């Protein structure tokens, strides 16, 4: 067991191992500090969870987040450097701290203020798809891909973070908000049981915005955003209408005048024809017909970067806990076992 020290930073007690020095608040599900890790030489983010075991819902969310971060071991995905508690037994266990690499800029800080060549767009979207091939091979859905959840460095190297932990509220998705502009229509309006294809819709929206410098579907509300989507990709045919489970959602769609799919070369003026072709394969209304991450990596747009011997898959991931009914203290015991069994990376 390391030695811990205590300090108060902006109204909060932080109790952390001596290896972490020069803590400074960066923001606030919990509170975050920047620190220097003397064991590894890296600058790190230390997150102190708020009220991790306050309800059955909160205790299960804490377990879910720790299981997911412990599993993810890939160059294009956020990984866990450390996890700790100052508790010496289950009986006094009440606080959880998570440690990752400190991230600088996000995709927003380069798409707003920088000139991107087609080669930059190839390399950035290649890396998102390499990370997604890995995540989807474990049967994990990210559910919240958008520019603010993608970290980028000076060498244009990218990491996926901030997985959807079943978090977002109704207030958070209302009106003129970037939290909804990247979501697939079937999850935005609860059409059907969704699956991993929702993440490929989000990659299409991101790729379009890197090419044009503008949000693809900046709706003022759910209905405005659906009208922008259907004007580009066309209204649904009878085959997709059959797959929408809500009768009211089917009746609403049938109230709209029919529209054909637009010509994407006339929308993405001057783009690489291979970029236009890949966008037409991602931005498909019927989720069964969208290109997968593994199929997209082999598309001719990425010929410069694609290496089928350097695009790894994940170890199998057991999510059977998701259907399990437990008490607060049972979820808290499972979480304690995962904290004490952690093995750091090389
Ligand atoms: C490289 C690339 O594809 C690119 C670059 C800048 C802008 C656009 N397209 C638009 O801003 N449009 C055109 C017509 O529709 C409304 C506005 C495309
Ligand atoms: Cl230490
Ligand atoms: Cl990482
Ligand atoms: Cl504790
Ligand atoms: Cl964003
Ligand atoms: Cl597992
Ligand atoms: Mg985020």
From Swiss-Prot:
Keyword Transcription regulation attached: yes
Subcellular location: Cytoplasm; Nucleus
Matching SUPFAM superfamilies: Protein kinase-like (PK-like) (SSF56112)
GO biological process: angiogenesis; apoptotic process; bone development; cartilage condensation; cell morphogenesis; cell surface receptor protein serine/threonine kinase signaling pathway; cellular response to ionizing radiation; cellular response to lipopolysaccharide
Motif (TXY): 174-176
The enzyme's E.C. designation: 2.7.11.24
Any GO MF annotation of the entry: protein serine/threonine kinase activity
Keywords of this entry: Acetylation, Apoptosis, ATP-binding, Cytoplasm, Kinase, Nucleotide-binding, Nucleus, Phosphoprotein, Serine/threonine-protein kinase, Stress response, Transcription, Transcription regulation, Transferase, Ubl conjugation
Control of this protein's activity: Activated by cell stresses such as DNA damage, heat shock, osmotic shock, anisomycin and sodium arsenite, as well as pro-inflammatory stimuli such as bacterial lipopolysaccharide (LPS) and interleukin-1. Activation occurs through dual phosphorylation of Thr-174 and Tyr-176 by either of two dual specificity kinases, MAP2K3/MKK3 or MAP2K6/MKK6, and potentially also MAP2K4/MKK4, as well as by TAB1-mediated autophosphorylation.
Catalytic residues identified in the record: 162
Protein kinase domain sequence ranges: 20-302
Main localisation: cytoplasm
Binding-site list for ATP: 26-32, 47
Cofactor entry: Mg(2+)
The protein's assembly and partners: Component of a signaling complex containing at least AKAP13, PKN1, MAPK14, ZAK and MAP2K3. Within this complex, AKAP13 interacts directly with PKN1, which in turn recruits MAPK14, MAP2K3 and ZAK. Binds to a kinase interaction motif within the protein tyrosine phosphatase, PTPRR. This interaction retains MAPK14 in the cytoplasm and prevents nuclear accumulation. Interacts with SPAG9 and GADD45A. Interacts with CDC25B, CDC25C, DUSP1, DUSP10, DUSP16, NP60, SUPT20H and TAB1. Interacts with casein kinase II subunits CSNK2A1 and CSNK2B. Interacts with PPM1D.
Protein purpose: Serine/threonine kinase which acts as an essential component of the MAP kinase signal transduction pathway. MAPK14 is one of the four p38 MAPKs which play an important role in the cascades of cellular responses evoked by extracellular stimuli such as pro-inflammatory cytokines or physical stress leading to direct activation of transcription factors. Accordingly, p38 MAPKs phosphorylate a broad range of proteins and it has been estimated that they may have approximately 200 to 300 substrates each.
Name of this protein: Mitogen-activated protein kinase 14
Annotated gene: Mapk14
């Amino acid at each position: 067991r390391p030695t811990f020290y205590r300090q108060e930073l902006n109204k909060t007690i932080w109790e952390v191992p001596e290896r972490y020095q020069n803590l400074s608040p960066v923001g606030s599900y919990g509170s975050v500090c920047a620190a220097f890790d003397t064991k590894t030489g890296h600058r790190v983010a230390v997150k102190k969870l708020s009220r991790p075991f306050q309800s059955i819902i909160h205790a299960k969310r804490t377990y879910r987040e720790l299981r997911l971060l412990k599993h993810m071991k890939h160059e294009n995905v956020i990984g866990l450097l450390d996890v700790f508690t100052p508790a010496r037994s289950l009986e006094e266990f009440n606080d959880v701290y998570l440690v990752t690499h400190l991230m600088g800029a996000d995709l927003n800080n380069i798409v707003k203020c920088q000139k991107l060549t087609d080669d930059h767009v190839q390399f950035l979207i290649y890396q998102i798809l390499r990370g997604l091939k890995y995540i989807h091979s474990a049967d994990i859905i990210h559910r919240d891909l958008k520019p603010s959840n993608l970290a980028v460095n000076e060498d244009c190297e990218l990491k996926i973070l901030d997985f959807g932990l079943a978090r977002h509220t109704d207030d958070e998705m209302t009106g003129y908000v970037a939290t909804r502009w990247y979501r697939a229509p079937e999850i935005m309006l609860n059409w059907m049981h969704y699956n991993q294809t929702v993440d490929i819709w989000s990659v299409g929206c991101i790729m379009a915005e890197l090419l044009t410098g503008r949000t693809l579907f900046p709706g003022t509300d759910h209905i405005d955003q659906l009208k922008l989507i259907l004007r580009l990709v066309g209204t649904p045919g009878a085959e997709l209408l059959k797959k929408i489970s809500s009768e009211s959602a089917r009746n609403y769609i049938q109230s709209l005048a029919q529209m054909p799919k637009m010509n994407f070369a006339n929308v993405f003026i001057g783009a690489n024809p291979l970029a236009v072709d890949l966008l037409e394969k991602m931005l498909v209304l019927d989720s069964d017909k969208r290109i997968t991450a593994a199929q997209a990596l082999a598309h001719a747009y990425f010929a410069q970067y694609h290496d089928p011997d350097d695009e790894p898959v994940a170890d199998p991931y057991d999510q059977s806990f998701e259907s399990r009914d437990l008490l607060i203290d049972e979820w808290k015991s499972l979480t304690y076992d995962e904290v004490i069994s952690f093995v750091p990376p090389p």
